[PDB]
Symmetry: D2
Subunit: 178 residues, 4 copies
Amino acid sequence: HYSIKEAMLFSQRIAQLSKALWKSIEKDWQRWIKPFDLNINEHHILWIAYHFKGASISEIAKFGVMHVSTAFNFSKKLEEKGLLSFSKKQDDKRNTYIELTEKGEEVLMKLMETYDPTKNAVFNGALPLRELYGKFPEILEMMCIVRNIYGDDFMEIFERAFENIKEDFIEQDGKLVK
Amino acid sequence: HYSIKEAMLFSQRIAQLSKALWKSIEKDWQRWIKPFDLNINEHHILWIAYHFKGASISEIAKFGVMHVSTAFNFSKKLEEKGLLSFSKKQDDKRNTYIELTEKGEEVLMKLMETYDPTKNAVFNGALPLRELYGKFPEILEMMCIVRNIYGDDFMEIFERAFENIKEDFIEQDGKLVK
Amino acid sequence: HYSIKEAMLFSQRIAQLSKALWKSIEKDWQRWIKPFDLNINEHHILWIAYHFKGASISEIAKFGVMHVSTAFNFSKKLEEKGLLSFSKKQDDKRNTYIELTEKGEEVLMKLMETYDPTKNAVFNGALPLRELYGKFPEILEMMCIVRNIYGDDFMEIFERAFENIKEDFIEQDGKLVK
Amino acid sequence: HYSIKEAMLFSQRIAQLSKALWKSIEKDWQRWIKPFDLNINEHHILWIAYHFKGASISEIAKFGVMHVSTAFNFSKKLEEKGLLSFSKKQDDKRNTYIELTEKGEEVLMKLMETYDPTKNAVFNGALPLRELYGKFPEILEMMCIVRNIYGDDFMEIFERAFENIKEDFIEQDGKLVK
DNA sequence: TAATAAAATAAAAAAATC
DNA sequence: AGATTTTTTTATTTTAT
DNA sequence: AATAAAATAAAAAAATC
DNA sequence: AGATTTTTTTATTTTATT
DNA sequence: TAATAAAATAAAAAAATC
DNA sequence: AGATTTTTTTATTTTAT
DNA sequence: AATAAAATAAAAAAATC
DNA sequence: AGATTTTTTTATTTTATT
Ligand SMILES: [Mg+2]
Ligand SMILES: [Mg+2]
């Protein structure tokens, strides 16, 4: 059992913090992918499909943090730009599934190449901690909180992106490459 | 140095973790302020003027993570709803200072009465951690990152809210009241 | 559940750490008190009495992490040196109580004067962390572990020492004094 | 910078934690090894020499947090009990290098099979934390502090012990075996 | 709709001019 | 750029004999 | 039992704002 | 330099969209 | 005891010496 | 410098009519 | 049950390694 | 400078104490 004050204190503090973060993250994310004329959720969708091939609209709307409507509309615009593949399987024909086309994987890799960590603000904001820790910050308390909110299945996005990028990419001339 | 691989690993973990965390906080925040016909940034501006009286447009755009222009446009709607008061100053009339009207302060205080932490998802997410530790999670690594991004003066908002809630408010019948 | 390998991995990591930590704290503690011809458990006994006046030999042994016989022998050795006043009282007389004499209080505070944090190596080892955090490390994970082993009653010594030192003392010429 | 009050608020908190933690580790470690009539520092020496074959007396004293006189005398007693081999090198003859004999390896790995986590207090104190996290506590803050006090070369023992337990041992019938 | 760049604008400060 | 509603569609599911 | 009819509920998909 | 003029800088303020 | 001061002692390197 | 053992000592608990 | 006992337990107080 | 001698430095190695 808890004081109401002590809740307001915790609720307001993590509000400000999570808004400060993500806005900083959103800015650096949209700056990096505007050259390729992708918006944030769009790019997130393509990454959802690369790690989770064949996902359903509601499934990608799960792993990217977006409404089901946003996923359908932004994923069909990725279809017309030729970056996404829609599909249906008629055991249950209410369900529309998406796959990444070759063009889309390509722009993912090219965006991966244009990545410059130094122009990302939380990267630079986290480097102090890394220096004395020996590793980048884990932010485990946040991962615990997120898990209890979204469920362990959601958290599959993390380790699918961890293992895949550790094995599906390498560094040559200071850029990430396949 | 660091690997550009090791960098991406950290950047995708924090990116998704914070989009998760903000969106969760976003919807719970929208839900409690719609009864009084506010949006997040409007409510955010009102709390900033409560804690930082007579602050510049650019200042409340600093403390609330918003653009100067969104600060000025939502700050004017708040005075057309009567909740804010605009002033200018002797030394430099380019600045425009903002104060809370007592209609504005009232709706803040009434919303504080409606606050049910049980309906906030991040709060329920942090309860298991609160039990083990005995106090709420501090997410200290994130406070450090945000600080090295926004700088020490942005971080006065956390301290001013902490002190003000603690010394301006008090519990009665499970609600926070003056 | 846990694998035996995973558990051994944790049990050696903390055994080596707690040994390392305790031994450096042991040396600096001895340096500090050898001038006054005290030993660790004697100095801890006197500090237990200062925070917990009228405490039993068994009770002193709880907070001082020492065997009850160890407390007994070292405690009456302190009475010969005239810093401790034994008592026996009221209903039950198998219990032997302790309080701190005038001579004992002064040697505490005088040792508190000779305190130089820079000669203590664990202080120095935490200074890099304190810069980045703002405050000293909270070492919460071992605080949780130490509680689960010893119980919430035991952890009252932390809480009693925190409050007493905070306002039974003040700083003068780089010295703690009453 | 820091206060002298703030400095000793930290010094006492880690003194008391360190002592509490080392003494529940002390007595759990003793109980485990008395069956094979070893003491803690003798058992440490056997694990130092297993992980670091050919270690010097001084080096053994580094990794096992003990005086060079104790590591010598307890290394001797291990030679008289037939578990450690004493060597010299003709290039520099003031050095004296230690190496486990096969009788020495066998007693270590029978004790490895004797290991029951559930009799260890610190393990059980840590199980609630492993529940929330998914992994055991890392107490990074204590690793940071200990690395600054002892230096990065000492800290090699954690990394070698980690990887050696990982690869040299396997789980058969709920016990760690080679 | 809740935000936001990209202009636009007015005022203060800073820099040029002699 | 990214929501909320509402529609509209399919398939389970639940009834009703 | 079987069915067949009738809500109820999954999953999109299509206008708002 | 001291009195003026010019350019830049700062802070909005409004406008064009997502 | 399970430890560790404190000398004590052999070697080796380092400084000195001319 | 610290314990693990012994002992010893009250008070409490349990067992007996 | 009311007592008195045998037994148990608590808390020191000793002697070892 | 090169060969020598002499000091310090290092690593045990043995003592005695809480
Ligand atoms: Mg933590
Ligand atoms: Mg605690």
